[PDB]
């Protein structure tokens, strides 16, 4: 399918509240780079998403050197130790309601589990 949506503007602490509520939204600038693009699967979208993030000066500076390297190859950045859950140690993309960036958010593993659990 194709990526659609506008996303939202974010500050210098974009994923600051990824472990609360529904997490952080897709940054508008990132949505502008992925919009109207086709992806074989959501996993492909996830990979492209993170790669785009590492190319955005304002967002990349919000991550350590090791996490930027991960995003650069399409992998999700590692979360803080306190936010992991078992072997799930990297940020995950949650579908609120599959390429509608306005229905996608970035959440920590711990929060992601709580969401689908009613919390």
């Amino acid at each position: 399918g194709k990526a659609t949506g506008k996303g939202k503007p974010v500050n210098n602490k974009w994923l600051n509240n990824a472990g609360k509520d529904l997490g952080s939204p897709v940054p508008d600038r990132i949505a502008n780079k992925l919009r109207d693009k086709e992806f074989k699967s959501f996993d492909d979208f996830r990979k492209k998403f993170w790669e785009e993030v590492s190319k955005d000066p304002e967002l990349s500076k919000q991550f350590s050197r090791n996490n930027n390297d991960r995003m650069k190859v399409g992998k999700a950045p590692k979360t803080r130790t306190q936010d992991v859950s078992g072997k799930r140690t990297s940020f995950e993309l949650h579908h609120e309601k599959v390429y509608d960036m306005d229905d996608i958010s970035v959440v920590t593993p711990k929060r992601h589990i709580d969401i689908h659990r009613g919390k």
Binding site: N66, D69, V73, R80, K87, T89
Partner: protein, 85 residues
């Protein structure tokens, strides 16, 4: 080699372990990386574990040398054995 404690690693050897982790960070998957990370968490015994690598304090350099410095100061402040010297 993957020693059992910080006392078996000279500062330089620990840096080599960090660069191996940096290499796995960019590998296709995290299968090998996560094993190296568990080992890092195990031997450092720092409460923040991997955060030392992925969420460095702003009071020090985000680099292998900075990571070694923080571990060194923390282990000294807690009366734990330091790197091999």
């Amino acid at each position: 080699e993957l020693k059992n404690s910080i006392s078996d690693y000279t500062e330089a050897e620990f840096v080599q372990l960090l660069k191996e982790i940096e290499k796995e960070n960019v590998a296709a998957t995290d299968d090998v990386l996560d094993v190296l990370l568990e080992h890092f968490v195990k031997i450092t015994e720092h409460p923040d574990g991997t955060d030392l690598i992925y969420y460095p304090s702003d009071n020090r350099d985000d680099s292998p040398e900075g990571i070694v410095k923080e571990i060194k100061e923390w282990r000294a402040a807690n009366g734990k054995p330091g790197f091999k010297q």
